[PDB]
């Protein structure tokens, strides 16, 4: 037996444990959404359990007593059973068989036939009893309240303090209700991630709340932060019309990038002659990357490399070399030493990484591996990412050296040691630097990501080359010349896009929103509220009923309410009448509204005032026969409060590391 | 699976306006490109024009200031209109429908099996 | 019609033949946008190759399709006695336009 119902008020519980009186808060968390579609059952398998539950039931003789949770329920995986004697409540975790029609035997153990591997056990007029369950991180909260009525879910208020919190972290998507022939009636719902307007009184007690997703008059409130709402027109929210589907379009290529001649190369190259290599028309995975090399991490500038598998490079270049432990800090941009001056020099606005790891069991030999050898003298420091193999005898002083090494003339290469009882520091280090052309020309080095159709005149999540965005895709006239890859805007917005794969231009625009206000009486007058949707025409009104076309979850009704177009949008709620009285509630355009008679909320064309036609002729003069005093009253302004504000005191309250960083600020 | 059938008179007089009608069965009309070719007797094919539901309405720019194309979702149907009809317009029509992975004004994919239109008095 | 089409063309069964489509470098060598329709007399043309070289489902791969500058090649291996009818290309003109080809009747010697 399965009813439905309206939740009402009922369900909301304090967000934590914290003291708060005599305040609004607004918090944001899994509520039961007021007026909501709950479940009456009377007196069976296993109900979901989604993201809470709330149960409640109103009874006189507690002939529910317990609960059971879990996923499977079948002694594979843990499961949670909560029941309860006439004075203490049992909580266990045991991985129970469950039998398919669980009950207390009026004690017994009839609701499961084994019970092993329990890892927690805890123990300590109508009356409606509610309570919440929610398994958020890795805690089972439960929330209790119990209220004497004289109905299954009254009108009233009563927040449900909370009751029992468990660390158990365990998986849980069904449940079942667990009683002791009889008959029994239960109220079931489901939770949702809503924002709530809470009123905590003097007492500390929730008073009162405002579901701000409920309907236009609820936002309002939220938005003002109030449980009363003036008369007036209140510029609330945006609607948006949400994405309905992803798209990834990236280039048709097959061949995997050819990482492993890089890292696994038998020999090095010395580091005033680092080799570079040219990696394009590749597929790049770099996760393989760490099987190659037993170096302990990346070192990327300007991106990340847990983000490389989603990108796409016009060309890469591997550029691999040997160094020592001292030297591995100079491959950096910005840096200066022998490296970075005569040997290799990276940009300051180097995109990129670096990946050294140490090779002293390959690089050193007893003796002392002098293959590898590094540039010590130069004339000028090297341009960034430039090589000079020359090896002509540097002249330290004024005297020629004519090719001959001797006084103020060196040879300009050294070698390193690299012997294997060096330190730490005087190891050799293989170097091999990544460096990412970027994506302005077409992307030939991409990630492994597979690539889906092509949807137009749509909201959809577009992802060309790795450029993310939402909007929508329309056929373009704008004509790009072969070399061009994309279009922008005044703000540098990508505008059109090239399609990899069909080399054809699409448009990006927005997908559609627009302001909100709610046209509203007092709420001591009245909760009906009128909705203006700001700069539309009465056909862009978001109509579908999903959860894909609109941030305000709420939805006044489209088309049964008189909808009216006025030069200031699409009003809905509002029925147009052709008299016109003084403006009420200023809407724009000339158009006003206001409160009228059932009563309802009428729009009219405002009225500047009443016509008269002066009886002008050129012999008739009017003339006053008559006077009266008349005393008026005129308000003005004159002085407003005087403040002062103790900047100290606001900004660093009794803090003296706060005033002594406060005052390096002038 | 679709199918597209197209239907309309098969004599118009020169100087009137040429009315045809495409209605499709097994599939709605959606978001797809609907698409209007014509081929004289003997001749190669000519592109026309075509429309999707959500508006505007792309035409050959030889006859885009006579082709107008609608769709109606309602009765589920595409609709051809050619003004200042001449003896030059009689000729095979088809109309053609894109699929999801050839989405775009180039789909031309499900292709109906046509009505010839005569001009003359 | 800009784009240019061979008049027609013939071939013996069992060789290979190749229809050519010279467009402009507005139309065929600025997309990937080819296609290559199967015309019988009498009956609707019949989409062959879509997207330069791919082949719709159900499509024998004798035919194959390929681009270079503005000219798009659709190649018929071991022809046979029904592969003789008409061929069209279809290209994507931009900003929305297709322009179709001025067709290639096919000859079997067979």
């Known amino acids: 037996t399965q009813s439905y119902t309206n939740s009402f008020t009922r369900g909301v519980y304090y967000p934590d444990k914290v003291f708060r009186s005599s305040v609004l808060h607004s918090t944001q968390d899994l509520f039961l959404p007021f007026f909501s579609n709950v479940t009456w059952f009377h007196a069976n398998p296993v109900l979901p359990f989604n993201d809470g539950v709330y149960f409640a039931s109103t009874e006189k003789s507690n002939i529910i007593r317990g609960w059971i949770f879990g996923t499977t329920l079948d002694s594979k995986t843990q499961s949670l059973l909560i029941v309860n004697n006439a004075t203490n409540v049992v909580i266990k975790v045991c991985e129970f068989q469950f039998c398919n029609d669980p009950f207390l035997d009026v004690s017994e153990f009839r609701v499961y036939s084994s019970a092993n591997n329990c890892t927690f056990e805890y123990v300590s007029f109508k009356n409606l009893r509610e309570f919440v369950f929610k398994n958020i991180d890795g805690y089972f909260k439960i929330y209790s309240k119990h209220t004497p009525i004289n109905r299954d879910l009254p009108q009233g208020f009563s927040a449900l303090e909370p009751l029992v919190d468990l660390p158990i972290g365990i998986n849980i998507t069904r449940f079942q209700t667990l009683l002791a022939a009889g008959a029994a009636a239960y109220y079931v719902g489901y939770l949702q991630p809503r924002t709530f307007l809470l009123k905590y009184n003097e007492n500390g007690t929730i008073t009162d709340a405002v579901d701000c997703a409920l309907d236009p008059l609820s936002e309002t409130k939220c938005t003002l932060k109030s449980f009363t709402v003036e008369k007036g027109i209140y510029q609330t929210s945006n609607f948006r019309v949400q994405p309905t589907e992803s798209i990834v379009r990236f280039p048709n290529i097959t061949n995997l990038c050819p990482f492993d001649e890089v890292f696994n190369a038998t020999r090095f190259a010395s580091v005033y002659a680092w080799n570079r290599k040219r990696i394009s028309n590749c597929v790049a995975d770099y996760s393989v990357l760490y099987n190659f090399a037993p170096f302990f991490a990346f070192k990327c500038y300007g991106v990340s490399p847990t983000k490389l598998n989603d990108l796409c490079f016009t060309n890469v270049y591997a550029d691999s070399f040997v160094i020592r432990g001292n030297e591995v800090s100079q491959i950096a941009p910005g840096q200066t030493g022998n490296i970075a001056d005569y040997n290799y020099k990276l940009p300051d606005d180097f995109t990129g990484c670096v990946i050294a790891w140490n090779s002293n069991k390959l690089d050193s030999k007893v003796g002392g591996n002098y293959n590898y050898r590094y540039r010590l003298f130069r004339k000028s420091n090297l341009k960034p990412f430039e090589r000079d193999i020359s090896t002509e005898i540097y002249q330290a002083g004024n005297k020629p050296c004519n090719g001959v090494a001797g006084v103020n003339c060196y040879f300009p290469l050294q070698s390193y040691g690299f012997r294997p009882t060096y330190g730490v520091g005087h190891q050799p280090y293989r170097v091999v630097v990544l460096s990412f052309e970027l994506l302005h020309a077409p992307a030939t080095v991409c990630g492994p990501k597979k690539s889906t159709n092509l949807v137009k005149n749509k909201c959809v999540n577009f992802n060309f080359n790795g450029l993310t965005g939402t909007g929508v895709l329309t056929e373009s006239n704008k004509k790009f010349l072969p070399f061009q890859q994309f279009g922008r805007d005044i703000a540098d917005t990508t505008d059109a896009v090239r399609d990899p794969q069909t080399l054809e231009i699409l448009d990006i625009t927005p997908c559609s929103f627009g302001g909100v206000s709610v046209i509203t009486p007092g709420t001591n007058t009245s909760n009906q509220v009128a909705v203006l949707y700001q700069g539309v025409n009465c056909t862009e009104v978001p109509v579908a009923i999903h959860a894909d076309q609109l941030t305000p979850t709420w939805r006044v009704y489209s088309t049964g309410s008189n909808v009216f177009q006025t030069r200031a949008g699409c009003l809905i709620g509002a029925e147009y009448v052709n008299n016109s009285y003084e403006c009420d509630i200023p809407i724009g355009a000339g158009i006003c509204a206001s409160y009228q008679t059932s009563q309802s909320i009428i729009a009219y064309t405002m009225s500047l005032g009443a016509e008269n036609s002066v009886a002008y002729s050129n012999n008739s003069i009017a003339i006053p026969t008559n006077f009266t005093i008349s005393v008026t009253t005129e308000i003005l302004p004159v002085s407003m409060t005087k403040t002062s504000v103790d900047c100290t005191m606001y900004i660093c309250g009794d803090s003296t590391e706060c005033s002594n960083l406060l005052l390096q600020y002038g | 699976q679709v199918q597209l059938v197209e239907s309309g008179p098969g004599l118009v007089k020169p100087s009137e306006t040429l009315s045809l009608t495409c209605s499709v069965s097994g599939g709605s009309i959606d978001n797809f490109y609907w698409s209007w070719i014509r081929q004289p007797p003997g001749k190669g094919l000519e592109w026309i024009g075509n429309?999707?539901?959500?508006?505007?309405?792309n035409y050959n720019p030889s006859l885009k200031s006579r082709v107008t194309i609608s769709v109606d979702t309602s009765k589920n149907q595409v609709s051809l209109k050619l003004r200042s009809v001449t003896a030059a317009d009689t000729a095979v029509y088809y109309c053609?429908?894109?699929?999801?992975?050839?989405?775009?004004?180039?789909?031309?994919?499900?292709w109906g099996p046509g009505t010839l239109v005569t001009v003359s008095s | 019609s800009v784009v240019t089409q061979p008049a027609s063309v013939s071939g013996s069964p069992g060789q290979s033949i190749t229809i050519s489509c010279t467009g402009t470098?507005?139309?065929?060598?600025?997309?990937?946008?080819v296609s290559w329709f199967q015309q019988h007399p009498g009956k609707a043309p019949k989409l062959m190759i879509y997207?330069?070289?791919k082949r719709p489902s159900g499509i024998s791969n004798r035919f194959s399709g390929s681009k270079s500058g503005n000219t798009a090649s659709l190649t018929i291996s071991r022809l046979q006695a029904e592969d003789e009818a008409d061929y069209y290309c279809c290209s994507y003109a931009g900003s929305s336009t297709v322009v179709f080809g001025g067709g290639t009747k096919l000859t079997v010697l067979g």
């Open positions: 470098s507005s139309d065929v060598g600025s997309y990937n946008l």
């Open positions: 429309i999707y539901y959500g508006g505007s309405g």
């Open positions: 053609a429908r894109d699929s999801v992975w050839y989405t775009g004004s180039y789909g031309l994919i499900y």
């Open positions: 997207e330069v070289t």
